[PDB]
Design an enzyme around this catalytic site. Structure first.
Site, PDB file in Angstrom:
ATOM      1  N   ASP A 131       8.364   5.176 -21.432  1.00 11.56           N
ATOM      2  CA  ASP A 131       9.690   5.364 -22.007  1.00 11.56           C
ATOM      3  C   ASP A 131      10.066   4.291 -23.025  1.00 11.56           C
ATOM      4  OD1 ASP A 131       9.737   7.376 -20.012  1.00 11.56           O
ATOM      5  OD2 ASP A 131      11.908   7.107 -19.738  1.00 11.56           O
ATOM      6  N   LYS A 169       4.467   6.440 -12.229  1.00  9.63           N
ATOM      7  CA  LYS A 169       4.924   7.485 -13.134  1.00  9.63           C
ATOM      8  C   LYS A 169       3.958   8.628 -12.815  1.00  9.63           C
ATOM      9  CE  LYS A 169       7.886   6.647 -14.848  1.00  9.63           C
ATOM     10  NZ  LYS A 169       9.267   6.486 -14.285  1.00  9.63           N
ATOM     11  N   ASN A 215      11.905   0.934 -16.560  1.00 10.93           N
ATOM     12  CA  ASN A 215      11.422   2.252 -16.160  1.00 10.93           C
ATOM     13  C   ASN A 215      10.326   2.190 -15.103  1.00 10.93           C
ATOM     14  OD1 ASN A 215      11.208   5.288 -16.613  1.00 10.93           O
ATOM     15  ND2 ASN A 215       9.099   4.624 -17.032  1.00 10.93           N
TER      16      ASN A 215
HETATM   17  O1  LIG Z   1       5.604  12.262 -21.814  1.00 15.69           O
HETATM   18  P1  LIG Z   1       5.237  10.882 -21.309  1.00 15.69           P
HETATM   19  O2  LIG Z   1       5.146   9.849 -22.351  1.00 15.69           O
HETATM   20  O3  LIG Z   1       4.025  10.849 -20.436  1.00 15.69           O
HETATM   21  O4  LIG Z   1       6.378  10.496 -20.573  1.00 15.69           O
HETATM   22  C1  LIG Z   1       6.803  10.858 -19.292  1.00 15.69           C
HETATM   23  C2  LIG Z   1       8.063   9.993 -19.191  1.00 15.69           C
HETATM   24  O5  LIG Z   1       9.012  10.581 -20.132  1.00 15.69           O
HETATM   25  C3  LIG Z   1       8.101  10.022 -17.672  1.00 15.69           C
HETATM   26  O6  LIG Z   1       7.264   9.315 -16.708  1.00 15.69           O
HETATM   27  C4  LIG Z   1       9.596   9.936 -17.361  1.00 15.69           C
HETATM   28  O7  LIG Z   1      10.169   8.669 -16.893  1.00 15.69           O
HETATM   29  C5  LIG Z   1       9.457  11.248 -16.612  1.00 15.69           C
HETATM   30  O8  LIG Z   1      10.275  11.787 -16.041  1.00 15.69           O
END
Ligand SMILES: O=P(O)(O)OC[C@@H](O)[C@@H](O)[C@H](O)CO
Ligand SMILES: O=P(O)(O)OC[C@@H](O)[C@@H](O)[C@H](O)CO
Ligand SMILES: O=P(O)(O)OC[C@@H](O)[C@@H](O)[C@H](O)CO
Ligand SMILES: O=P(O)(O)OC[C@@H](O)[C@@H](O)[C@H](O)CO
Lengths: 262, 263, 262, 263
Positions: free
Chosen positions: A231, A44, A9
């Site tokens: 993730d 992210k 990821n």
């Molecule tokens: O809710 P959290 O744990 O911050 O997660 C966001 C992830 O699900 C996120 O970066 C994902 O790959 C987003 O689209």
């Protein structure tokens, strides 16, 4: 040929990328009928919590990806978050990824299209299958010629996503379709400071995707998902990757006979 | 294990329509010997949107028609009940008693079906979560049912639309055998105002998904001329396409089967 | 005048009914601008669990309701579950209630209509506001002249209901509209063997209902909700009933000025 | 506490349109002294469904137009940003920086807004649950914001439709001041294919609901001739109806206020 986008990821370290890249290279040599594309995020940008892991930056990330591309000769794909990032990312990325929440941000789409690279758009959880027609049109307008639309779930009440498989044939009318087997089962903000998900449904829904008909699958994998910085609930153990690919290729071989026209 | 295929015209428009469809189902049961066929048709559409829509010719006439089908073709039979009193008579001919979606929570109806000794197939309500079916099965076990089925027929998704959440198949498999209703799942509830609509073009793809995920059977309504059906005219499969759909799902099932998870 | 349907969810005992009935009679004398209708179910025919409380039967229930009607002179309303129950229930019930899951069962509707009594239909959680037009038509066909449609929430993902207030004006085109302030906040099968709900939202949403415009409110109350045998999570403490009624009458007085025509 | 009313034309179609609407908002701010008015208009529609739809005349032109409004009428200003770089310049004229719905999770955009010292109003994403806004507010507090707002603008309910779950108002009030967007809430996303649709007939009733439940302000776009708007033509309120709507909600708020719950 059938597309398989896979990788960790987030770029937790270029070390992790080389490990996963090694396994993907091996599968690449084993499944010549498949086109593998290494995927990983240099950032992210949409974590639920300000205290969660984001990454090591665009510079360190593009550098690590290039290492994977040169060391294993694997095509690359990562996602951008603001218009300025398109150009530098295109240096390495064969396919530029547009985040789901950002699928309607015109400038981001145009920026990506301009790089001359292929563009893959994650269908927003708020979007209807037919609404993707406009997304494709923006990209064509911007000069994109290789366009993909990825199914990754739809808002279904709170903290839940449902995969309406009717979207696969609908989106196929205007673009190649990829199924994201990883994000489709996650539970948005399910853990409070993070999103949840149920790994037990990844394989079943991926089998459904190929039975219905899609041009590719997107699947995130990690040597030790439990330790993943992002993730964690939905990433697939690197060791299970081979079995799932073989499984989807067999199902596809038989099912393809019934894939509807256009 | 034998794969279940529940098929037939949605409503018992006439005893002749039944024999017409039954004849083809019998021909197919002869070819697909690895499949257990069950002939379905409702003696009453007790939940039409409009008071002016077709309902049926009665329980008496309907049961008589279904019996004719069982006697002439040797096919098993299934039909739905709408009130407790109907369980007993219907059980005289029905091998599997079907419980309508809107009624999946009515304790007495479930109990009435269970005590007949017949098999019971519950259509999962459009308002029900997959994990909420556990109590539905418990109620049936409590009332004496030894052969229980749970049917996936879609969930309310916004207005006049349904979505199929395939995660329901493995979830429900934890407590009962699972059937996928390929025809009502593409239905658009109240989509045409006085009637419900539907998208036939999605029946086949979703049925392929169902068998790839893994289920114990499929439920699909078929009719000689869907366009002229007195009910579900938008989702009923043309009888001539039946054979091909079945062959295809048996093929996808076979190749996918080795990957079905253990519950 | 403004309708207020209230009472204990289930007829746990005719003793409980007389207690609640006493308080409702008092409010009835205090708020002459309001028409109170005592409500209670002689049977919970749709419990999630086979091991949950249902009731003491139709005979014991109709008897207890009549006691309330004679002792306090309050109109009555209870729900039926199969066609045969309509006639006996009509002996006491001024308004016959059709359960939400059963709102499309033609025979039940016709049975109720035939009794000559008024009929109140709980809008199915699977129904669209506009789909209620057909429901009303069935009743008219059956001879019903006093028809009500009750808003009680709509399926929103799993184990959750949302109240689309757009429905109030939409349903008003063909019937008098009642807002169920109690079931609208419950969480279907939320507790596994039972449904949940959040009492903290009952008052806020009820205020919204009258601000938007409705012909009445439906509200279940119990001396000690926590001990209630059914709908414990959503029943209102008998003691809070007066304050809420006064509150909705004041909001209605001011808001009514802006209620749209038809 | 002073009630907030954010109003103005959806998009800065021209500096003249702004002054036209601003003039009326100024007249109203004079009458409704118990209300704090904030003039809103976007310098760019960065998320249109179609590439052929109106976007705007640029950030430069837009900010210039908004400044004209602030100088001529003495009204506070708010407009939305789409990428981090826009925060700084926009903050020169904007009293409240608005964060688009689709972007409510983009950490850098939120941070860019927060560090300007200006107030920040986040439109709750159509994909976000009410309780998920707590982290949105945390991010802003982390980036320096001292005045934070959360706007309710509807949630995805099936395809091309939104529903307003009023339980969100008291939930979100736990960590921020709450605004109700009366115009985008009745919007039908992608409803017209190349454009989004909407149902103007529901704006007023839902706004009454919002103030009866309890909120700290309302956001409503208005235009001299909604039918001719270059954006949100289906949900924009005719400028002449503005005064009446405001009077009505101040009245409903007053009578309901004594019943607002303590968080
Ligand atoms: O809710 P959290 O744990 O911050 O997660 C966001 C992830 O699900 C996120 O970066 C994902 O790959 C987003 O689209
Ligand atoms: O809405 P209408 O067309 O009456 O349809 C109801 C049918 O689709 C119905 O009988 C279906 O078989 C119901 O469960
Ligand atoms: O899910 P359980 O707790 O059985 O609850 C069902 C109640 O919510 C029920 O009888 C209610 O009044 C049904 O409509
Ligand atoms: O779908 P279209 O009409 O482009 O509309 C997008 C608008 O409604 C949009 O700019 C709205 O103001 C978006 O958030």
């Amino acid at each position: 040929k059938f597309l398989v986008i896979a990788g960790p990821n987030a770029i937790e370290s270029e070390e992790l990328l080389l490990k996963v890249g090694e396994e993907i290279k091996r599968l690449s040599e084993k499944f010549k009928e498949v086109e593998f594309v290494f995927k990983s995020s240099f950032d992210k940008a949409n974590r639920s919590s300000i205290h969660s892991f984001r990454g090591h930056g665009l510079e360190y990330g593009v550098k690590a990806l290039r290492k994977v591309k040169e060391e294993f000769g694997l095509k690359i794909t990562t996602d951008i978050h603001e218009s300025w990032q398109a150009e530098p990312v295109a240096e390495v990325a064969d396919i530029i990824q547009i985040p789901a929440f950002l699928c309607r941000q015109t400038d981001l789409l145009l920026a990506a299209a301009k790089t001359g690279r292929a563009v893959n758009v994650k269908k927003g959880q708020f979007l209807a299958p037919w609404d993707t027609k406009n997304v494709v049109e923006k990209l064509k307008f911007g000069g994109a010629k290789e366009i993909y639309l990825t199914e990754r779930g739809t808002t279904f009440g709170y903290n839940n996503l449902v995969v309406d498989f009717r979207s696969l044939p609908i989106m196929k009318q205007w673009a190649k379709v990829i199924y994201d087997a990883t994000h489709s089962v996650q539970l948005p903000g399910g853990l409070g400071d993070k999103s949840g998900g149920m790994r037990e449904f990844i394989f079943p829904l991926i089998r459904a995707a190929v039975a219905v008909g899609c041009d590719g699958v997107f699947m995130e994998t990690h040597p030790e998902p439990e330790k993943a910085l992002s993730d964690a609930s939905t990433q697939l153990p690197l060791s299970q990757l081979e079995g799932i690919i073989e499984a989807i290729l067999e199902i596809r071989e038989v099912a393809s006979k019934y894939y509807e026209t256009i």
